[PDB]
């Protein structure tokens, strides 16, 4: 089997993108976060506290599929500071014409101010290694390790837009989606992450700098965070850029033209255009723009956001031993 998903930004800034899900019998379509960087499929419920609920909801009990995982709870929280927690029930899911069925669809007895006050998405669906998964006593797989068995090929695909459309595959690699050729490199799962090695970077049409770049493909980071030295070599070609202690990272006139950045994927590069690092302006009207491109200093793990995997084609390959692949579109 297969799966195709459109993708869809939530807001004018990319801030992160959603993608219909359909859970339990009759399906309820609910808009989720794919997030390759967790592995909870949770979401909006009946039984979240009706004063944190603004999104659409899963009913279980509306669900003849639906059932209780006896004695399992969850609880979870995010780099952002968000969180929620609740129970586990047991669903049919479908992604794109692809059914799962016994999925773990945790439900949310509580969610934090960042998921009401975001109207737009009505849970996450992880899609980094089960071994994070938040429930207890036993963890459950996510989305993809359940569809392994069915897929014909244990592979997905993200192709995220630039304020536009995309798609999320499952179980093939659609040759028209990318240029040139697919480069894959290693993959550690040591973290649970989908955690690779860049061979390093340049600076719009400067040198390449071979220096290892351990980081994180996340679906659900907006932005890219680079160490620090590489991302202050980056705003150095940006002349009104600086960083702002009160605004939170690099800032710089929204009239600049910034350069590309470049990340080396093995022998291979992906180039991030000079507009993708444009984030937008600080407040509607502003003169200042802030920065797609940020230090990792202050999270303390460097992380291939949005902003660097809408510039790929991107192969999350979940054989046993797992590959990330990259190709230019």
């Known amino acids: 089997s297969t799966g195709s998903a459109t993708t869809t930004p939530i807001d004018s800034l990319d801030d992160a993108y959603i993608t219909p899900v359909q859970i339990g019998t009759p399906a309820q ?3 989720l976060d794919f997030d390759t960087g967790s592995s909870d499929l949770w979401v909006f419920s009946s039984e979240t506290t009706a ?3 603004x999104q659409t909801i899963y009913t279980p009990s509306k669900s003849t599929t639906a059932k209780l995982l006896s004695g399992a709870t969850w609880s979870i929280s995010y780099g952002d500071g968000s969180s929620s927690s609740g129970d586990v029930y047991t669903d049919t899911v479908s992604v794109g014409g692809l059914t799962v069925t016994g999925q773990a669809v945790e439900s949310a007895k509580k969610v934090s ?12 669906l992880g ?18 390790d359940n569809a392994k068995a069915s897929l014909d090929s244990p592979v997905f695909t993200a192709d995220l837009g630039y304020h536009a459309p995309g798609t999320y595959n499952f179980g093939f690699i659609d040759t028209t989606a990318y240029t040139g050729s697919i480069t894959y490199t290693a993959v550690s799962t040591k973290q649970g992450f989908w955690e690779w090695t860049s061979t390093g970077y340049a600076v719009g049409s400067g040198t390449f700098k071979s ?3 351990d980081g994180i493909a996340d679906t659900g980071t907006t932005l890219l965070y680079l160490p620090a030295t590489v991302v202050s070599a980056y705003w150095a070609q940006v002349s009104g850029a600086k960083s702002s202690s009160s605004v939170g990272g690099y800032v710089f006139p929204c009239s600049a033209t910034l350069p590309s950045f470049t990340f080396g994927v093995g022998s291979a590069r992906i180039v991030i255009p000079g507009d993708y690092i444009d984030f937008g302006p600080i407040s509607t009207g502003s003169s200042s723009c802030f920065g797609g491109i940020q230090s ?7 992380i291939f956001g949005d902003v660097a ?6 192969v999350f390959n979940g054989a046993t031993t797992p590959t990330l692949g990259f190709a230019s579109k």
């Open 113 to 124: 101010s960042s998921f009401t006050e975001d109207s737009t998405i009505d849970g996450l």
């Open 296 to 302: 990792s200093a202050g999270i303390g793990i460097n």
């Open 127 to 144: 899609l980094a290694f089960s071994t994070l998964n938040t429930v207890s006593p036993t963890q459950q797989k996510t989305f993809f």
């Open 309 to 314: 995997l809408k510039a790929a084609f991107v």
């Open 51 to 53: 004063s944190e609920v």
């Open 211 to 213: 220096t290892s770049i």
């Open 29 to 31: 379509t609910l808009n």
